[PDB]
Structure formats: C-alpha cells, structure tokens
Structure 1
Amino acid sequence: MMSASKEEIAALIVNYFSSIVEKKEISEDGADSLNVAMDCISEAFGFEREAVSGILGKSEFKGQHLADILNSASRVPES
C-alpha cells in the first residue's frame, strides 16, 4: 500500500498472531511460543506490544489482517 516499511509489516505480523490465538487456531503448546515471539518482534522494531492498535490506525491497514491481505494476493508463478 504505502511503503510496507518494517513497522507496517510488523503490525500485520503481530496482528495475525493475535488473530490466531483469539479464535484459538493453535494449541497452548505453540500459543505461548507466539506469545513471547510477538514481544520479541515488538522490541526488535521498537514498538509496544499493546500499541498495535495505534499502528494499524495511523497506517492504511485498518480492518486488514496479514491473512486477508495475503489471501487477496493472486501471485501466479510463471515458471
């Protein structure tokens, strides 16, 4: 959309993980793994875990998850 900067992508990544655990699409085994990984990602790029709501707002990715976005990507391999 805009530029797909590290912060733009990061927000969608953590949002995707949040979506998975929300509707419980993963077992508690991997749930805690993504739980901590999400925080590591947040610290790496320099943003708060609970600040994802603001990032999705300031960026033009509101109402869009990494899943739905990729789901709309009809990449055709012309190998």
Structure 2
Amino acid sequence: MMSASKEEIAALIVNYFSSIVEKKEISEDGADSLNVAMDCISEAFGFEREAVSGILGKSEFKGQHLADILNSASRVPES
C-alpha cells in the first residue's frame, strides 16, 4: 500500500545488505564496502541503521525482503 518513501526504500536496501553479511555470503572486501556504503546511505536519506527495524515496522514490507519483492516483479516491454 506504501508508495515507497525514501526512508522505506533505503530501509529495504540496507536490510538486504545486512542480510548478505548476516549469512556471510559476500566476500570480506564486499562486506566492508557495504559497511561504509551503509553509513553513506544512512547519511544520504537522513536515518540511522538500527532505525531500519522501525521503518520496516511501520511500513508494510514486513515479512518480506528486498529481493523477494523484486522477485514478484515482472515487466517485459518488448518493443
């Protein structure tokens, strides 16, 4: 139902990055990259990292993940 506000989008984005390093799927180098990137994401959108837990609590992306959301998408503009 949400129109995907800035904080809401960033929330899913940083949450996904958190999930990547959570399951330690990414390489050490990339993990550090996601860290400094996350500081920048937080600085850019004007929110704190742990605030994602609150943002994704208010917004109804709950029970889902960014990639699961993208998985449900399907657009083939065959021009």
4+ residue segments displaced more than 2 Å: none
TM-score by length of 1: 0.91
Unaligned runs of 5+ in 2: none
Residues 17-67 of structure 1, C-alpha deviations (whole Å, 9 max, x = no match): 011111112100110000110111011111111111000001111111111
CA distance in 2, matches of 1:43, 1:64: 25
CA displacement at 1:75 relative to structure 2: 1.6
Consecutive unaligned residues in structure 1, runs of 5 or more: none
> 2:46, 2:78 → 1: CA distance?
38
- Provide the aligned C-alpha RMSD in A: 1.0
TM-score by length of 2: 0.91
The alpha carbon displacement at 1:76 in A equals: 1.9
Residue 25 of structure 2 corresponds to residue 25 of structure 1: yes
Quote the residue 1:38 is aligned against: 38
